[PDB]
Design a protein around this nucleic acid. Structure first.
Lengths: 227, 228, 227, 228
RNA sequence: UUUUUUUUUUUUUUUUUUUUUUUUUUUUUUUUUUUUUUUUUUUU
């Protein structure tokens, strides 16, 4: 009576990031602008702890002009609460807005210019990557980019790999990306089929500063006078 | 100001898992089914933390329709409370239900299918073991299985060994398992007598994927292409 | 106003464990017996955490029939409060009672029998040391024994060293023992003078079960590996 | 429905440690004496935990005769609050009092005697540094000293580098310092210009015991005879 | 030259570690999903 537990059932996954993205756009597309994409991408972690502190399972948030209805599972008890396929987590939202940046870029040159001039990703910065390095590569640092592997040319995967080898990141964080699809190909398929594109991606990512989150170029060229 | 201290004394162990199990069945057997057992095996860890939080000495819990009166020794101070041989801790509860699944499978075909299709052991999966691998083996991953070394065909021991050698497990954990009995044969006895069976078990456990639970080969084989 | 702070100044210690022990015997010696001592050594950690919980500076404790007026500096805020040389902390109490057992054994064989048949020190045990191995050695595992390095034949020091090499003990715990005296010799002296006797002690402790904390090898295992 | 969020957009470097110091002295210079500076430096960490506990956005503190209006930003939730340049953080306060000591010593023989005989900086001692080793050097161990790289002859920098090299300190703690000025020289400037002075400082700091304090040789030596 | 996270004198000082025994107890390891969660977060 003091503590009661109850059963979750097994299932397979009916969640298509493409569809979730489209429904998300149809639902919120009027309040999305490069300004909000930018405050969010600067407010991801802040929102991470902000959700972490609060105990409500279904919180709505405001980034500037953007209103978002998000599921909160950062809070401990909620880590196993269910999440609808039309629902949005900060991870899913992040991926979605990254996707938005990617399409918006292709829409034309004025479109190409605005976001590029106004979009920087802290996670990408901390490793010293900027837009000039590549579009797919640069946007791939956004969490949730793993949902759109093709558009980002296997770069989120490669980045995760580099995190494992150089930053000794715990291997479990590759769990999510290793379930994800490459177009029509299931994980099991592309894990053997597409090794080439992946290795190429790894190379591409390798040729990057990878500064320590991050030291302006004066560092770490000065700290290699003392070692 | 006062704090309050006195002597605990030494004795031998009068706890028979076979019988303890029998009283557990006699007492709770009407609400034990594959459903509730499955709910237990999925909520072991959660309930463990929930017991860690509370300082109550004797907590009651409900897994689906099954209610059990459990002794709490996960709360730090409570780690030294006495435990009756007719009392139940989660470890004992797990072992008991592991044994229950083990018997129920032999009860017949419907029961075998019910248990096999429902019951899930997180620890076994996390190492890539499934029901198809074996009943004794798959169930041996359940905590408390060490209390029934015979029925689980010495497998929990083999698993523990496999854990120390590749996962660098702290050896201290083998303390419980290394005193456990083989049916009636004593630890000191079976520890040289049945060496063959043990070795066979170790070999069986040896051939398994044994990746981290989240992914298993060829997820494992794909990392290999870059990093083990 | 909100919190304020103030000075402490210090250079020296006037604290002689011999004198402290003698005063302790004079004050409490009628209530000291193998029963109470034994209860103490089994409830040391318990009382220690119980003191960690309480914020009171000077707590009363009862071990069997023995009541003690002990100083509490286990509470974080209290960790830098002063300690009189005639005062008693759980560490001082433990060391004192270790000394007491050591003397009581010499009083005759019957007293030796009460202490040996009753008193048990968990830390000595966890390493597989028993009374049969030696009195000085067995008692040396008791916290506070470092105050009487002479009587315990350098064994607490050797034990601390072995904790560092085999158990990866953080070296900081040896700070205390390395300031202690060996009878009349100060630290600076015996650290060079008694190196031989110390090494002998180390060899003794070394040839002990240890191997490892948490285990008794009733039967050996054709392990792939040990430890 | 609402967890209010909004944007800060920026990158400006107002804060001038010289000016901050001058305002701080103008405000408090009369209540600063060797006594209070000493008690402060002895109560730095305590004040740090005590403020971590508190919810005040701006806490008030008393060190001996000195009362100060300090900004509290060690508190998790408070960790993103703004900080005025005429305001004082406990880091800033520490650096400021270090500078104070540096000026006061030069005031004369008697003042030098008060400061040298009273003020002790635990971090400097913990590495075996004493007043006799140097004034700038000894004072450089004080947190916030990185604000006055000129006065302390690049010693806070050298000490930090040395923390990374000898104590494997996470390199991120070298952030600040690597933003600070050397008198007029910008970091981008002095990082190339004053390399000579830098390494000299580095060597000076290298020529120190730098053992846990903690221990003194013989002891390091006594340990060496078994372990490091 | 934001802010914070670590590092804190000197004592025969004080704290932080290690804590017998048992078919005892506790400490470790916890499924599957295009699920969710834990790490990595610009610029002074």
């Amino acid at each position: 009576d003091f503590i009661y537990d109850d059963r979750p059932a097994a299932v397979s996954s009916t969640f298509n990031p493409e569809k979730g993205y489209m429904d998300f756009i149809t639902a919120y597309g009027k309040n999305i602008n490069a300004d909000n994409v930018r405050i969010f991408f600067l407010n991801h972690k802040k929102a991470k702890d902000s959700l972490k502190g609060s105990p409500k399972v279904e919180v709505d948030l405001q980034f500037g002009t953007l209103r978002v209805k998000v599921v909160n599972n950062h809070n401990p008890r909620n880590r196993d609460n269910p999440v609808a396929d039309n629902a949005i987590t900060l991870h899913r939202l992040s991926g979605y807005l990254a996707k938005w940046c990617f399409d918006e870029i292709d829409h034309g040159q004025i479109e190409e210019a605005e976001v590029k001039s106004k979009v920087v990703i802290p996670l990408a910065e901390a490793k010293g990557c900027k837009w000039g390095d590549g579009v797919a590569l640069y946007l791939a640092f956004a969490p949730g980019a793993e949902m759109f592997l093709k558009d980002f040319e296997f770069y989120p995967l490669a980045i995760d790999i580099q995190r494992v080898v150089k930053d000794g990141m715990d291997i479990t964080f590759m769990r999510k990306v290793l379930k994800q699809r490459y177009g029509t190909k299931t994980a099991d398929d592309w894990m053997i089929s597409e090794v080439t594109a992946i290795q190429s991606a790894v190379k591409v990512v390798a040729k990057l500063p990878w500064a320590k989150a991050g030291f302006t170029a004066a560092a770490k060229n000065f700290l290699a006078k003392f070692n």
